[PDB]
Scaffold this active site. Sequence first.
Site, PDB file in Angstrom:
ATOM      1  N   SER A 187       0.852  -1.207   0.000  1.00 37.47           N
ATOM      2  CA  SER A 187       0.000   0.000   0.000  1.00 37.47           C
ATOM      3  C   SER A 187       0.877   1.242   0.000  1.00 37.47           C
ATOM      4  O   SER A 187       0.431   2.308  -0.379  1.00 37.47           O
ATOM      5  CB  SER A 187      -0.909   0.041   1.223  1.00 37.47           C
ATOM      6  OG  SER A 187      -0.133   0.340   2.381  1.00 37.47           O
TER       7      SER A 187
ATOM      8  N   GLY B 184       2.372   0.676   5.805  1.00 39.70           N
ATOM      9  CA  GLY B 184       2.702   1.104   4.438  1.00 39.70           C
ATOM     10  C   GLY B 184       2.782   2.614   4.244  1.00 39.70           C
ATOM     11  O   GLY B 184       3.729   3.121   3.648  1.00 39.70           O
TER      12      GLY B 184
ATOM     13  N   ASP C  31      -8.235   3.835  18.185  1.00 37.85           N
ATOM     14  CA  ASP C  31      -9.027   3.826  16.967  1.00 37.85           C
ATOM     15  C   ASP C  31      -8.773   5.144  16.205  1.00 37.85           C
ATOM     16  O   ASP C  31      -8.830   6.198  16.807  1.00 37.85           O
ATOM     17  CB  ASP C  31     -10.501   3.772  17.359  1.00 37.85           C
ATOM     18  CG  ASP C  31     -11.412   3.535  16.182  1.00 37.85           C
ATOM     19  OD1 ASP C  31     -11.666   2.361  15.858  1.00 37.85           O
ATOM     20  OD2 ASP C  31     -11.893   4.508  15.580  1.00 37.85           O
TER      21      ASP C  31
ATOM     22  N   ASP D  73      -5.634   5.713   5.092  1.00 37.55           N
ATOM     23  CA  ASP D  73      -6.024   4.758   4.057  1.00 37.55           C
ATOM     24  C   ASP D  73      -6.768   3.626   4.738  1.00 37.55           C
ATOM     25  O   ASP D  73      -6.160   2.653   5.112  1.00 37.55           O
ATOM     26  CB  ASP D  73      -4.800   4.156   3.401  1.00 37.55           C
ATOM     27  CG  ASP D  73      -5.155   3.204   2.225  1.00 37.55           C
ATOM     28  OD1 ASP D  73      -6.291   3.275   1.724  1.00 37.55           O
ATOM     29  OD2 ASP D  73      -4.300   2.377   1.830  1.00 37.55           O
TER      30      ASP D  73
ATOM     31  N   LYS E  52     -13.019   4.791  -0.835  1.00 42.27           N
ATOM     32  CA  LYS E  52     -13.448   3.621  -1.601  1.00 42.27           C
ATOM     33  C   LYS E  52     -14.603   3.968  -2.513  1.00 42.27           C
ATOM     34  O   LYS E  52     -15.475   4.741  -2.133  1.00 42.27           O
ATOM     35  CB  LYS E  52     -13.873   2.493  -0.639  1.00 42.27           C
ATOM     36  CG  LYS E  52     -12.746   2.122   0.342  1.00 42.27           C
ATOM     37  CD  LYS E  52     -11.510   1.618  -0.387  1.00 42.27           C
ATOM     38  CE  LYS E  52     -10.287   2.506  -0.183  1.00 42.27           C
ATOM     39  NZ  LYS E  52      -9.482   2.147   1.044  1.00 42.27           N
TER      40      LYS E  52
END
Length: 357
Positions: free
Chosen positions: A188, A224, A260, A277, A306
């Site tokens: 990623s 990533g 979180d 991401d 998305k």
Amino acid sequence: MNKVVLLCRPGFEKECAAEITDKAGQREIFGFARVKENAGYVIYECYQPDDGDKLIRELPFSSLIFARQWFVVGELLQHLPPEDRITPIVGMLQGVVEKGGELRVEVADTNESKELLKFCRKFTVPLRAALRDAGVLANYETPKRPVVHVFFIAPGCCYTGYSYSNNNSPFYMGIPRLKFPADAPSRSTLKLEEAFHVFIPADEWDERLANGMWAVDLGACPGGWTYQLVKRNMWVYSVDNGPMAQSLMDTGQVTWLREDGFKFRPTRSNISWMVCDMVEKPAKVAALMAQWLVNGWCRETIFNLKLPMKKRYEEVSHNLAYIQAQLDEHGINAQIQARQLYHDREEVTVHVRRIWA
């Protein structure tokens, strides 16, 4: 010339076609875009004879989400004589552009065109010499002059034209060529690296992606995107209930906060960058990005949204409009840009920069 070619991800032609029709129309540059499914390009054909040049001058290329690259072209050359493919190309470009600063002989990014891509590489030098002889290309390359494109859609069939280097992609086929580093913990990483290349002008990296900046990576595990921030010598808060790759921790640049990403709120440091991401719904991500911007928690952000299965251009436009509505309500001025990067699939990457002078 009235046709503009846009390169896109194969399968995203309807999104690219709707989008260019929409945004050109908004500037009263009217025309039509037929779609060939899975072709990896769209042609927007203007109703007025010279609106193609107008369009690639006046509409900012940065505002197109589903186009990797574009250029204005003349008529399709269909029967290139294998004994001399060069003369007709030269003939088509002569008097259309002179003293171009660079030549790119390109194809659509599909499986069917891979052999054609190798042809294009072989053809480049002979064509460059002929175009220089004809005065179509300048004798010396220069980034300021227009880029000349010759776009092969099948063997012996091509379009010819140009784009302006201050309003286009600077990459061949609009694809920055990156190598995966074996030490990164996720592939990623290439998405964020590609984002830095596509969204931040190379000569501004040292100032805007700067050594010593603080950054927050939301939903970071296993790392990533953190990897790219660390590579820029930033100090990074990697936020995730999941653990970060030990290799990142060992750099001494990364603090792992086991929280979180949606719940985390920064206190303490002056955060320049936030990146995100996450596998979450895009309205939900967009809401969190808008909160970070209107709360002043970052100066710039890059994040992924998305796409849904249908109405993909609409959905992503609505997400962006939400973020803009939040900005406007709070009186914050920012620049927003977004692009379906090469390393994106059914998602788009977005960059927002607050304008603070």
